[PDB]
């Protein structure tokens, strides 16, 4: 049964009201997709509202990509979305995590010049 793929896809597309309706009907927020990726991992990092709704319903912020070991905070930092990064950190997203190539969230942010994010992460440390 495919409500796990419907929740991940809606999160990936930033479709807040579709995520909300799926969660309300009992779609499990920590169910992985075909690539073993959870909604919080595949979500449109531009949508802090999707992130908060996932977390309100019990999504875990620290789940790692089973290959890359990228966490949600790595992608939020790499794409420069401070709002989503704050929501994730507030919920318990560890900022001291390294991906497969030994990069921290603050590394991804600095390398691309996402200064609002890099400053937030340097201060939170």
């Amino acid at each position, epitope marked *: 049964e495919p409500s796990a793929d419907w929740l991940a896809t809606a999160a990936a597309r930033g479709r807040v009201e579709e995520v909300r309706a799926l969660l309300e009907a009992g779609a499990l*927020p920590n169910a992985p997709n075909s690539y073993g990726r959870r909604p919080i991992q595949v979500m449109m990092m531009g949508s802090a509202r999707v992130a908060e709704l996932l977390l309100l319903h019990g999504a875990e912020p620290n789940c790692a990509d089973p290959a890359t070991l990228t966490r949600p905070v790595h992608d939020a930092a790499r794409e420069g979305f401070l709002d989503t990064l704050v929501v994730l950190h*507030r919920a318990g997203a560890r900022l001291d995590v390294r991906d497969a190539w030994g990069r921290l969230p603050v590394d991804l942010a600095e390398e691309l010049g996402h200064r609002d994010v890099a400053r937030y992460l340097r201060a939170a440390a």
Partner: nanobody
Amino acid sequence: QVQLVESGGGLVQAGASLRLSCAASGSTYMFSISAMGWYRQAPGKQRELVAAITSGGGDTNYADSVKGRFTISRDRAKNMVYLQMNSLKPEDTAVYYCNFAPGLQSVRSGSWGQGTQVTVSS
């Protein structure tokens, strides 16, 4: 604002168990989306984070000194954070505080409740 009230402490002998409760009221919204932790301040020592838990309740961080003796948990529906304290040692003697724990690490805040005194005698 979030109002946190702490209970469960008092006097035990070494080897004993306690269960601390932190109950949230007010912006229980803010509480439900927030990582929470149990902090302790021993006499003559700096306040330290001993246990932290994600919003979701399924992911935890512990100080190595309490890891495996203390379990943090939460009841998302009741707006509660618990610390089950097993195998208590005299060095666990402290005032225990619940607060936010962003990133499962220590908050920087001037907003603390009264805490709950835990005294472990030999």
